[PDB]
């Protein structure tokens, strides 16, 4: 569920998804086009591709099981859809933490007009 | 969250909450009046009472942590509200499983017009 | 900005966008496909079409000016993009209020698998 | 919200906050140290102090209500935090317009190395 993904983002980065990742670059948040601008944007591009491969799953609201017990995100065992959505979310939240050193406040509210180039393939 | 409670019900009873428990007897699903018709209905009555003690909590939509590891439901650590809601849901799903011996398909879509007895006190 | 649209939804419908409208039917929330299921879903379909005509605007994060002073939502004068985004948001929030009489809790977390029909043209 | 403050700055000064005010002198934009270099820089120093009194508020990202209808910025009614943040932003944007006669393009991208010395008290 998207609120669980936002919790993973906050757990990993210490930043709230709104405003820090919801409008970042060309791919962070809903939708996206063109070329990923940097490492942070590329995490979001991969996440969008990950969800795209799950067309038979309810990626936005299926509530999966996960744990923080070990001091990192672990996806619980469940339905194929729950495990796959959780895995997309976990990978993206960890990727965003790894990309923190190159996060640019200048890309925070990035205009769609700067994302008009050919769209990268998943 | 209601969708997590529905997953607990499926896990414990082996029946989907919709249609098997969402309209059952006088108390299963949202609301309720009169007297619980049987053991299954009484689980739902107790669940309504459990939520009734949590007026300061977002009982229907707060997403809590839980696990199915080792074949039973375990509520994870979180806010006081998450833990309390999870406990209501876990107890009700286990109660519904224990009430399977008297589950009646005839009570599945029970008309609220037949729930005319005095309403039971929590 | 999406947070302003969510405030308009709450003001008009008296329901929070999450969970009541974010996953409703085939078109409410981000994206959509197939045929709108009812009046509420049709508001969301029209909103998607409205935003679709605003490709040169930053529909998700451009913060427009609006007022609730008169007891109704009134869009402030501003840039062409601010006025157009505000107008999409205001019309949709009012449409959702007018559709309240047929709002179905059963359409709340609607699966994409039930939206597989031919997609309606804007 | 910072994007609303940037719209107020544009309305008052006729300059976009990025690049004209976001890196100006010792205090304009995020952070600041030393002594304000000029009237423009002093506006930004006072704005930082204003936000400093609002530690319980989300100064950068809370979306408040404001109007330009009268030909002047007027803060609308809202939560205590929204009203207080809007007041800080309104005062600063007006101050920047009043400081225009001494705006120096030479202070636009001012180096932190020249903001050595004792930091002024709020
Ligand atoms: Cl924001
Ligand atoms: Cl969980
Ligand atoms: Cl499965
Ligand atoms: Cl929800
Ligand atoms: Cl406003
Ligand atoms: Na963007
Ligand atoms: Na995206
Ligand atoms: Na009930
Ligand atoms: Na019933
Ligand atoms: Na849907
Ligand atoms: Na939509
Ligand atoms: Na500053
Ligand atoms: Na500077």
Author numbering:
A (entry chain A), B (entry chain B), C (entry chain E), D (entry chain C): 1 to 122
Q: Please, what does the article write about this entry?
A:
In the present work, we report the crystal structure of the most abundant CB isoform of crotoxin, CBd. The crystal structure of CBd was determined at 1.8 Å resolution. The asymmetric unit of the crystal contains six individual CBd molecules. As expected, the structure of CBd is very similar to the other natural CB isoforms (CBa2, CBb, and CBc) and to other group IIA sPLA2 (EC 3.1.1.4). Two sodium ions were observed per CBd molecule in the crystal structure presented here. All six CBd molecules in the asymmetric unit contain PEG 400 (present in the crystallization solution) in the interfacial binding region near the canonical calcium-binding site. Analysis of the protein interfaces in the crystal structure of CBd using the PDBePISA web-based interactive tool revealed two probable tetrameric quaternary assemblies of isoform CBd. The tetrameric assembly of CBd can be considered as a central dimer (A,E or D,D) associated with two peripheral monomers (B,C or F,F), respectively. Interestingly, the central dimer interface overlaps with the sPLA2 interfacial-binding surface and the CA-binding interface of CBb in the CA2CBb crotoxin complex. CBd differs from CBc by only one amino acid (Arg74Pro, respectively) and by three amino acids from CBb (Ile19Val, Arg34Gln, and Tyr115Asn, respectively).
